Amino acid sequence: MDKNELVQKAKLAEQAERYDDMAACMKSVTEQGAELSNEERNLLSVAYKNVVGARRSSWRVVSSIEQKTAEKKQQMAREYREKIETELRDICNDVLSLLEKFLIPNASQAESKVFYLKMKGDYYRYLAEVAAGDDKKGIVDQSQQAYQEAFEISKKEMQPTHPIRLGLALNFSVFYYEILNSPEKACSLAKTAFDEAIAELDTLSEESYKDSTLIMQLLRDNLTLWTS
Amino acid sequence: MDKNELVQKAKLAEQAERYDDMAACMKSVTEQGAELSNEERNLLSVAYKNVVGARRSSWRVVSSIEQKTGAEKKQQMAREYREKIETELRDICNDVLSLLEKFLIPNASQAESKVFYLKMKGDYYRYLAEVAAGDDKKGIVDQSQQAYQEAFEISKKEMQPTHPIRLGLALNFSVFYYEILNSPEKACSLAKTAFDEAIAELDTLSEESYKDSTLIMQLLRDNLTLWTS
Amino acid sequence: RTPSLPTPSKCGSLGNIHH
């Protein structure tokens, strides 16, 4: 019913590990038209990361089985993969519709704009993971374009230690490495984001120092993995 | 999709942790009317244990939250969600129980299979009992007890004391006594006897089963240890 | 697993082994 009821229900669903419900609640909140609070935005992101993540995981497992085999068996694996892909696409399109119609329009502050543009990049990235052929070049570009706009704004409006800025760098670096298969650009972005953050350690805040340093370490972890 | 396709698909679903798909496949196999192979029976059991297990887990979490508060409207939210979960859980149990009554138990031509499905009937009625209130409950508890009891009797007459399915039945039936009927004394006695009978006839272990036997024997002890502390 | 940004009892009945 009311925004408060939905958010209470979403929080119950989260406790119950029932993310489809959680997503559905936060979709209704989003559709009421008003800008989401930080709490609500985190709830929305978590719900959908989990919902889509189950399909991503399934897809990798089935895809890996498909390639590792015969015939008829591969025909079964391939048809299941496609069933999962269709689910995954519907989920991504649901989020991306939400971003375009509600979340990005209503973003009053640079932080929020960066966050949703990052999220747009992510869901297009999830589509790209699963896209074949003629569709793909266009989905990849959509992802890059959303990340890139976010990156621009983040560099203009946000300190180099801001968790959301560092998060974007992490994900954008991952886009370069996994989707565009460009490790040098991936390393350079991650290294720069890290280096700029240690250079402005002065800027870490009460509210954020934990998230900042955590994501800084994730950047290093990826760099270490990638330069081995 | 023929029986072989559905089983292949159920195995895919299991790999992908998509248990609702897994259940759907194995339900169709079951509905084709013929007695299930051990492989198929295990696939059915796993699918539904996972499907129902998600709801059981959710229900405990929400139920705990509900009673721990507070805002009479926040409680009313938790209560209504609990009910949504219970409805899902009941539908799943009724789905399995229907399958048992229409296909699995009628077609169980051998004692081992009969014990397996009767135990399963006990379990799904037990899952209903976990969640039932008031007038319904005494009747659901009885259905559970009656199914376990028929299984127990057959198992004691027709199966060696080390048979995994017999020991598994003892484990679950002991759990029924402890959690549903709140009779720890009866629960301990059943578990202890089943264990004791097994060590006494250790020479009955088979190549196919010795691992499962000794594992379940240890689960019985674990429960006894927990319960007598 | 993709190393992208992360997104921050029982009864004692028969364990159902997974195969």
Numbering used by the authors:
A (entry chain B): 1 to 69, 72 to 230
B (entry chain A): 1 to 69, 71 to 230
C (entry chain C): 211 to 218, 320 to 330
Recite the paper's sentences.
The intrinsically disordered microtubule-associated protein Tau is a highly soluble and abundant cytosolic protein. The microtubule (MT) association of protein Tau is decreased upon phosphorylation. We show that binding of 14-3-3ζ enhances cytosolic Tau solubility by promoting phosphorylated Tau removal from MTs, while simultaneously inhibiting Tau aggregation both directly and indirectly via suppression of condensate formation. These 14-3-3ζ activities depend on site-specific binding of 14-3-3 to Tau phosphorylated at S214 and S324.
The pS2 Tau phospho-peptide consisted of two short Tau sequences with phosphate groups at S214 and S324, connected by an unstructured linker (pS2: 38 aa; Tau210–222-GGGSGGGSGGG-Tau318–331). pS2 showed efficient binding to 14-3-3ζ (KD ~1 M), which also synergistically depended on phosphorylation at S214 and S324, as determined by fluorescent anisotropy and thermal stability assays. In full-length Tau, however, the same peptides are connected by ~100 aa (also largely unstructured with some beta-structure). This, to some extent, limits our interpretation of the binding affinity of pS2 to 14-3-3, which may bind more or less strongly than full-length TaupS214/pS324. The structure and binding mode of 14-3-3ζ dimers in complex with the pS2 peptide in this study were comparable to previous studies using other 14-3-3 isoforms and Tau constructs. Thus, co-condensation of Tau with 14-3-3ζ - being overall acidic (pI of 14-3-3ζ = 4–531;) and having solvent-exposed negative charges on their surface —could be driven by electrostatic interactions, e.g., with the positively charged TauRD. Extrapolation of the pS2:14-3-3 structure to full-length TaupS214/pS324 indicates that 14-3-3 binding would cover and conformationally restrict large parts of the TauRD. Thermal stability assays indicated that full-length PKA Tau may bind even stronger to 14-3-3ζ than the pS2 peptide. It is nevertheless clear that these two phospho-sites are important to the binding of 14-3-3ζ to Tau, and the interaction of 14-3-3ζ with the TauRD explains its compound impact on Tau MT binding, aggregation, and condensation.
